[PDB]
Symmetry: C2
Subunit: 464 residues, 2 copies
């Protein structure tokens, strides 16, 4: 990895565009205008990409040669980068202040700030904008996943009277559906801020290396079938596949995809009749989890529950909701996103089915179908020092008032009612709102403040 080649190309030309005699460039990150966001992911970026000796003679030379051909010109600031290498032994003279990881902050508040610590490195602040703006992705995955936890908590509390097993109700199925291996690890780790169920193995090593947990692993999985392990038995031997799989995993929970040919027939005749004796004998700690994987997600879930409820002994819980026996559960792992999750739990509640009966598996909806536009994550310059005089800087486009940026030195404070407020124009210097809630997390190539994954989970907890 070469930080000199980890920026948008046009940033290579910006050192020539700032007003002459600029000694300071101060910039901030916010999720402009999903009313609250989970701040997570910055620590990964600081450790993997920004800390220590990030500049070498070889990296300067590599970047010089690439930019010469990429621009068909020599616009690359070799002098500026050589200065960092000679003066600071390749350590970035940058200071980053951030809100603690796991923090749940309303939209339109400063989340982190970046500024150069050496007047010669005024151009460095916005050079690293590209790498830091990528924090949008673990922030959005964590926020969207927590918003799904809120829906699940509401319906589970309503239909069961408690939140037992909440942290296992939304399972990450997204490994194949993401754009890369690196995205998988980052995305799966952000989902693990709110839940404990994951199949995206990549997320576990990321948490271990960059955050750390008291427990040996932050996430868990159960054995489960795929279409290939059922279909390989042949069209006429689906019962044999099912029987073999539940016998191989007789003492542990097992998920079995049952829609290869006909989900309703598999539920009513195979599980419901032919193999029913192998299901009713299972332990409460080792249920059979039936998995539909096609059709309308809500209509399929309701029909599968109606079928199972007629083949198996259904009880009525203390809230008046139907509950499958403890050796039998369902997982809907096709077409699950925040909108369909909501339609399914509401549809289940209307048909008097307890949310304790179901878990959700989400792939693309959880980790891929997200953009920087969802929370409007933006990095903007708000303060500059030119000729020793500080000026409050901002954009305010005529056709888009929502794109107006904050002015001057920023500070995050607790209001008297215990809410959050961002103070602009260095007004935080007046001691009217107490202490700034951002902490120096990076200074001159060193990570100065870190959070464990346990702290992050605690900060990201629901009020509920």
């Amino acid at each position: 990895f070469n930080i000199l080649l980890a920026t948008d190309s046009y940033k290579v030309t910006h050192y020539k565009q700032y007003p002459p005699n600029t000694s300071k460039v101060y910039s901030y990150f916010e999720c402009r205008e999903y009313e609250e966001t989970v701040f997570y992911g910055l620590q990964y970026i600081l450790n993997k990409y920004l800390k220590g000796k990030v500049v070498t003679k070889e990296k300067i030379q590599e970047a010089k040669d690439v930019y010469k051909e990429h621009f068909q010109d020599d616009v690359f600031n070799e002098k500026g980068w050589n200065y960092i290498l000679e003066k600071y032994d390749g350590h970035l003279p940058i200071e980053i202040k951030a809100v603690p990881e796991g923090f749940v902050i309303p939209r339109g508040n400063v989340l982190f700030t970046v500024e150069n610590t050496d007047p010669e490195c005024y151009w460095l602040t916005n050079w690293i904008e590209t790498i830091l703006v990528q924090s949008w992705y673990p922030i959005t995955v964590a926020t969207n996943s927590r918003e799904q936890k809120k829906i699940l908590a509401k319906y589970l509390l309503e239909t069961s009277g408690n939140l037992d097993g909440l942290e296992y109700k939304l399972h990450d199925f997204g490994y194949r559906g993401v754009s890369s291996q690196e995205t998988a690890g980052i995305g799966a780790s952000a989902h693990l801020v709110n839940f404990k169920g994951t199949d995206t193995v990549a997320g576990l090593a990321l948490i271990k290396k960059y955050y750390g947990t008291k427990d040996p692993v932050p996430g868990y999985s159960v054995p489960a079938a795929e279409h290939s392990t059922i279909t390989a038995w042949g069209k006429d031997h689906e019962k044999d596949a099912f029987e073999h799989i539940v016998t191989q995993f007789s003492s542990v929970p097992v998920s079995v995809v049952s829609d290869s040919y006909d989900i309703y027939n598999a539920c009513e005749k195979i599980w419901g009749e032919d193999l029913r004796h192998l299901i009713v004998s299972r332990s409460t700690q080792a249920p059979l989890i039936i998995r539909p994987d096609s059709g309308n997600p809500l209509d399929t879930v309701l029909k599968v529950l109606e079928i199972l409820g007629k083949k198996f002994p259904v009880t009525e819980n203390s809230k008046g909701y139907k509950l499958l026996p403890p050796y039998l559960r369902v997982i809907q792992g096709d077409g699950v996103d925040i909108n369909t999750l909501q339609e399914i739990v509401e549809g289940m509640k209307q048909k008097m089915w307890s949310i304790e009966n179901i878990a959700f598996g989400s792939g693309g909806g959880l980790l891929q179908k997200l953009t920087r536009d969802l929370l409007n994550c933006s990095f903007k310059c708000s303060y500059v020092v030119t000729n020793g005089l500080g000026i409050n800087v901002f954009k305010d486009p005529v056709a888009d008032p929502n794109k107006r940026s904050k002015k001057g030195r920023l500070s995050l404070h607790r209001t008297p009612a215990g809410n959050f407020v961002t103070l602009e124009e260095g007004k935080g210097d007046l001691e009217e709102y107490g202490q700034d809630l951002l902490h120096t997390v990076f200074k001159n190539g060193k990570v100065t403040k870190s959070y464990s994954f346990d702290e992050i989970r605690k900060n990201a907890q629901l009020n509920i």
Copy 2:
């Protein structure tokens, strides 16, 4: 990187679920039936993750320890992995056959096939499904980018009579808007299959290392301003920022973001009057590229052109379309996706403005706002050998006929009309069509067939 930890967790349990005495598991990838797809990206995956000694004693031990905690059970095929390490020195006994990279294939056709070459490694075929299915991402970026090239080619030919500069009309602005650094490189490389303009530097090193070009670089950029380089001058000094930037880049093309405060005022009064003398003196090889960055993308583009057309000498080309002078161009780099690109070029054509006047910059729309659902990229088992007898396997869900998978051994052929056909059930073995268009690209840990980035671009060319 550890391939034993680069799969969906549940795949760790599948070796126990296949029918006993299974010696072969044969699977294929297709974009289930954007009528045609660009096949690109597999070569990157084969080289970075699948080739050479991918199994070591340390990797087996690491995976064993992780899976023990992840499952709270010892469900990990240590014996199977130890077999690969001892017999093949950690090289995968897999054979991958694929359509050549850059190939443009209609939906619902086999693109690549995977099968184990050793009977003991029947479970390996679908173990690597997760890593190979991630090919969906460079395939979708390449396909969506080529579809935008088709729209641009149609409107540029209609309004100018040629395709000059077509390869520079859609610029990659997506670095900050993607989920990770790795995604950035893969995504920007897939856009470079169709275009030459990129700011996502990461894509250049990926092409150089995995594909290679005769040219020193596959992509180019121009100097350009950002809001920070303009706003840093102060709200009252936007004209000074503009003047400084165009003077610093007087001899090369320069893009200048002009919507910081009021895009229409910047076009009419700053560029159109105060700085007009610095613009009209510019070379044809060094235009000023005005960049709006907010508002309704089409309304803003049309209003900017109407303003500029009244301040600068406009000509009418041989097709009857208005053309700005050669030292002045526009780039729309906000809210550009395949749908808005289409609305803008159609709206320009309706107002008699040539497409030679404009270029597009696309960020999230180009590299992030894509999912595996767009082309329905899917990996499925189609053939198995159990007890020495081959059987044609497939899924066919009752509620979703579109999810039906192909049966048996597959081959891709040219039809008599020169189209593509996928033959099922080993019917390709009858010599009724020509040669199978799938070639072995990977066999027993070695990459057996490679394509240069030059070949890929030629294969992905538009008919026009």
